[PDB]
Design a protein around this ligand. Structure first.
Ligand SMILES: [Mg+2]
Ligand SMILES: [Mg+2]
Length: 123
């Protein structure tokens, strides 16, 4: 279960990675921006799950998601967007792009554990 986690906040990456670890997911690769995330997916097509934010320089998460879904290798990759964009207009926008599960920031460590366990369970 190779996961890639993309967020331009170092503290957010910390919390997500720790939470995944608590759930038994240890094979976690990170990226700070969309460009870097895309390079990593393209070069590590064995990646099983993409977890991404939305707002970030160097390609935003919506564009990343569209690009992933347009690639023949990643038609079925689960995509989890974790973002402060809580408005339903944004939710709809992201689901249409190919996001499968949408988790709205901010959360406590425990709430993130609960919401990720819903999607991924334990490993
Ligand atoms: Mg961000
Ligand atoms: Mg937050």
């Amino acid at each position: 279960m190779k996961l890639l986690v993309v967020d331009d906040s170092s503290t957010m990456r910390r919390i997500i990675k720790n939470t995944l670890s608590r759930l038994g997911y240890e094979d976690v690769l990170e990226a700070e921006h969309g460009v870097e995330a895309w390079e990593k997916l393209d070069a590590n097509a064995d990646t099983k799950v993409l977890i991404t934010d939305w707002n970030m320089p160097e390609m935003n998460g919506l564009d990343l998601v569209k690009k992933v879904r347009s690639d023949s290798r990643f038609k079925e990759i689960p995509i989890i967007m974790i973002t402060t964009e809580g408005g339903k207009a944004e939710v709809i926008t992201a689901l249409k792009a190919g996001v499968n599960n949408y988790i709205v920031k901010p959360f406590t460590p425990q709430v993130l554990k609960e919401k990720l366990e819903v999607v991924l369970g334990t490993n």
